[PDB]
């Protein structure tokens, strides 16, 4: 049977892939990094608390100025903050109360957000009339928007609970490319620095690397035992990390095509909601449903730090492009800035 043949052939190929990876596993990251020095106490402290959301916070994103950020909340607003002053630059009442993601456009001109309305809404910040309006409602997903990241001010990538991700042309509102392949809700995405690739993590427990300009999946990383809730590129575009409900983060290498490291501990039993790298990649930061953000040593795999000032789940984090700071966002309604 044609169908049975294609099914065994897929197995053979999964096996071929597994063995090609094992032929590459000549050593471990942990062996290789075995004699560099630990990082010491990574002692970070809250410099700012951002108080204003009236309910759970679901997501945030730093502007590239390493200064403003957007946050998305159960209260049905985006707040755009100036973390230097704690001043709300904009507070944006949304059309749908069920927002769960958001993104600052690199240019600083636009933010995006969306959620259970299944739409990616593009708000324009600098109108000529000095007002904050929805410029686009990007519609086409048949499932909640779970994540979104602008490439520039006329293209944006989204991920959804419809198990796809997509690329959009803003001016027209069209869904120019569809990234299919996942078999579970897609939860998260992360653009490469060059923006010619991105990775996505899903409820299928797998992460996928996509080429933006060609619309296909290049590689598929497995090994988590449960949903991938978060994902982040390592700063040089050749590895990324994920955080999962299985309570581990994991580093996967593109060019070796496989897991290099797990970041876990018998004690940490709760799922990860969010991950980010320090500027140098040396540190992996992960928010956890136990209210903390652990700082891991990316090369060695040791817990190096903890950020502990949230009374509910840490639901999102982010590091500035200038590397000066970490934002955590929580189900307790507050964002905190740390270093």
């Amino acid at each position: 049977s044609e169908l049975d043949q294609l099914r065994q052939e897929a197995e053979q190929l999964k096996n071929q892939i597994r063995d090609a990876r094992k032929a590459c596993a000549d050593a471990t990251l942990s062996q290789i990094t075995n004699n560099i020095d630990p990082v010491g106490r990574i002692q970070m402290r809250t410099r700012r608390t951002l108080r204003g959301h009236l309910a759970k916070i679901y997501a945030m994103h730093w502007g590239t100025d390493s200064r403003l950020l957007v946050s998305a909340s159960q209260d049905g607003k985006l707040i755009i903050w100036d973390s230097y002053t704690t001043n709300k630059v904009h507070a944006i009442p949304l059309r749908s109360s069920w927002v769960m993601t958001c993104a600052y456009a690199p240019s600083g001109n636009y933010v995006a957000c969306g959620g259970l309305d299944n739409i990616c809404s593009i708000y324009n910040l600098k109108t000529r009339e000095g007002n904050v309006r929805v410029s686009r409602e990007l519609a086409g997903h048949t499932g909640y928007l779970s994540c979104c990241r602008f490439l520039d001010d006329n293209q944006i990538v989204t991920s959804s609970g419809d198990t796809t991700c997509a690329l959009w042309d803003i001016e027209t509102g069209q869904q120019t490319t569809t990234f299919t392949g996942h078999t579970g809700d897609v939860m998260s995405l992360s653009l490469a620095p060059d923006t010619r690739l991105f990775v996505s993590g899903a409820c299928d427990a797998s992460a996928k690397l996509w080429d933006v300009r060609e619309g296909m999946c290049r590689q598929t990383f497995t090994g988590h035992e449960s949903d991938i809730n978060a994902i982040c590129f390592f700063p040089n575009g050749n590895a990324f990390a994920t955080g999962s409900d299985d309570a581990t983060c994991r580093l996967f290498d593109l060019r070796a095509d496989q897991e290099l490291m797990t970041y876990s501990h018998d004690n940490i039993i709760c799922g990860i909601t969010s991950v980010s790298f320090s500027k140098s990649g040396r540190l992996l930061l992960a928010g956890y449903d136990d209210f903390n953000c652990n700082v891991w040593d990316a090369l060695k795999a040791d817990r190096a730090g903890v950020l502990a000032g949230h009374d509910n789940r840490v639901s999102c984090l982010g590091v500035t492009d200038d590397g000066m700071a970490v934002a955590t966002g929580s189900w307790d309604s507050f964002l905190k800035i740390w270093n």
């Binding site: 009236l54 059309r95 749908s96 109360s97 259970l116 779970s146 949903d227």
Partner: protein
């Protein structure tokens, strides 16, 4: 101490409360006095497309009321020339050929009956029904309707809402007093029955019955029955608010006047017949008809009163001997033997006889023995005095036939049979209905029993308000002034808002499900009530004080249940929350209570349903 309309925000809730009940239809709103009033104010003045329609509706309704043929000739000309002819000459007359032709034809045969334009009426309704209704709804005149319904639906009457004056009647279970309903100024009677006196004499069913019966006959504004506008109670008392009749009853006047000439009797009989008619069209038998249950008003016109012993025959025809000895038909007096309408027609005879002769036909030689009057009602036919004119003679023998199949009124067409008796040849029944006949008599200026929860369960559903009675009461008293005052009060709140900058309306441009005032406890240790403006979204309930935006909320996730609760002996909503916490809400009116209960429940269910399908939002173990 007088009616205050809730603010226009009340629309968010009432529109939804009504919608759930199917009440937002042109049919259901147009047919309410206040609804009609508001819809017409809207058409005439705030929409030059529907002005002509309603203007045309009203000219026809005026036409219907014209008393004479001379006058209907004149008005039909005008109405035709103005709302038909001209509208045709400008190809702008959205009605059937049938409609036009029906009227046209009739006019040239100068054929002008009161129903002349009925064909248009149905079609004018057709044309207002659609987009016009729809716009009316979007307008502030429908907001005004919501303001007025909310008052309606929140009526809870107490003795304290009336100014009680002098006693005007008494019997077994209580007293009637004249009163003023403070609100509107409207004069009524208040009939108070004592629940103790009742329980004692085991007439709990009889007081219940008088209410249910009143509730059947009180619509349609019958000027010959003493109808009900409200009923409420206290732990001690049943209270019916009834039509006020200051002139006392016939039995008193009978004995004051002596007997009545036929012509005098004729006046009374006519008006009574019309009242009987009204009740019979509503499948009610009064059963206790007699001078003393006929009251007079200040001018001498009369009405049937006290439906205690009255009875529905819409389904079960009654059989029991119930009335007053002297006036009860045979089928009445005969138990197991069933009877409908008929008995009133016989009592009518008996009572009519009694106004002519001072005694029931079946009460001979001052006799005070009941079993005697029973006997000679069942047994003997009616010896009618030499003096009874043949027409009267015909009527009384027609009414007092012992065989129901042989009794006037009972032969298939009801009251009409009786109206056609030659005894009434001289009456124009429209003039009787109009109360245009001069009345004969112008009234001259005048133990240790206990109460269990099982008693007060029997009166659980005694309270009601007759909607139409209330709207009419309001319509003719304070509706205009209150609309002006409230219009005026609204125009100032909108003046304060262009200046103090509360312009943007928080509840728009999003997914707000409903908003409105409620009151919560904000002091945990203190438990006072804070009125706040709430906004319900699908994932949360926000509220704000005045001036500032919302700074607190609950999430539909936090909420585990919504239930009614008693607080300061006021029905409130109790919200149980996540932590084993609690949140208490008081609404300003019953419909608001009902709607917040439903929507909160609905919203918390859906939100929990939804969140559970969403890995980023839900709880993880």
């Amino acid at each position: 101490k007088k009616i205050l309309l809730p603010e226009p925000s009340i629309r968010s809730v009432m529109q939804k409360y009504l919608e759930d009940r199917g009440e937002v239809t042109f049919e259901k709103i147009f047919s309410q006095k206040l609804g009609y009033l508001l819809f017409r104010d809207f058409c005439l003045k705030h929409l030059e497309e529907a002005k002509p329609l309603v203007e045309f509706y009203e000219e026809i309704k005026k036409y219907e009321k014209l008393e004479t043929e001379e006058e209907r000739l004149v008005c039909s000309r005008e109405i035709f020339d103005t709302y038909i002819m001209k509208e045709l000459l400008a190809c702008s007359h959205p009605f059937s050929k049938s409609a036009i032709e029906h009227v046209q034809g009739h006019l040239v045969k100068k054929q002008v009956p009161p129903d002349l334009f009925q064909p248009y009426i149905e079609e004018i309704c057709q044309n207002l029904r659609g987009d016009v209704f729809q716009k009316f709804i979007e307008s502030d005149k429908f907001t005004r309707f919501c303001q007025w319904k909310n008052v309606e639906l929140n009526i809870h009457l107490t003795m304290n809402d009336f100014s009680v004056h002098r006693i005007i009647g008494r019997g077994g279970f209580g007293e009637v007093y004249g009163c003023r309903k403070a609100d509107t100024g409207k004069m009524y009677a208040m009939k108070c029955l004592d629940k103790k006196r009742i329980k004692m004499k085991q007439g709990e069913t009889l007081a219940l019955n008088e209410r249910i019966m009143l509730s059947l006959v009180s619509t349609g504004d019958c000027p010959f029955i003493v109808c009900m506008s409200y009923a409420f109670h206290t732990p001690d008392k049943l209270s019916f608010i009834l039509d006020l009749m200051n002139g006392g009853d016939l039995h008193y006047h009978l004995s004051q006047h002596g007997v009545f000439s036929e012509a005098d009797m004729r006046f009374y009989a006519a008006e009574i017949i019309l009242g009987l008619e009204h009740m019979h069209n509503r499948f009610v038998v009064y059963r206790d008809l007699k001078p003393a249950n006929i009251l007079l008003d200040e001018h001498g016109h009369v009405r049937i009163s006290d439906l205690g012993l009255a009875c529905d025959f819409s389904k079960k025809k009654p059989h029991a001997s119930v009335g007053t000895h002297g006036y009860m038909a045979p089928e009445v007096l005969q138990k197991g033997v069933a009877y409908d309408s008929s008995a009133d027609w016989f009592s009518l005879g008996c009572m009519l006889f009694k106004l002519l002769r001072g005694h029931s036909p079946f009460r001979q030689h001052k006799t005070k023995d009941k079993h005697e009057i029973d006997r000679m009602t069942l047994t003997m036919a009616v010896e009618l005095p030499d003096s009874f004119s043949p027409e009267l003679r015909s009527l009384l023998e027609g009414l007092l036939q012992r065989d129901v199949n042989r009794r006037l009124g009972c032969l298939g067409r009801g009251a009409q049979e009786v109206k056609e008796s030659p005894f009434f040849r001289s009456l124009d029944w429209q003039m009787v209905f109009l109360q245009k006949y001069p009345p004969p008599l112008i009234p001259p200026r005048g133990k240790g029993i206990k109460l269990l929860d099982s008693d007060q369960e029997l009166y659980r559903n005694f309270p009601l308000t007759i909607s139409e009675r209330w709207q009419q009461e309001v319509a003719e008293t304070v509706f205009d002034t209150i609309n002006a005052e409230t219009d005026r009060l609204e125009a100032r709140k909108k003046t304060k808002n262009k200046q103090l900058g509360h312009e943007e309306d928080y509840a728009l441009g999003k997914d707000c499900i409903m908003h409105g005032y409620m009151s919560k406890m904000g002091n945990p240790f203190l438990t006072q009530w804070q009125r706040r403006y709430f906004y319900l979204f699908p994932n949360r309930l926000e509220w704000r004080g005045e001036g500032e935006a919302p700074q607190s909320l609950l999430t539909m996730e936090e909420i585990q249940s919504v239930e009614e609760t008693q607080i300061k002996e006021r029905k409130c909503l109790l919200l149980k929350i996540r932590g084993g916490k609690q949140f208490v809400l008081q609404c300003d009116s019953d419909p608001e209570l009902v709607q917040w209960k439903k929507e909160l429940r609905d919203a918390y269910r859906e939100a929990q349903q939804l969140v559970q399908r969403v890995p980023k939002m839900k709880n993880k173990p």
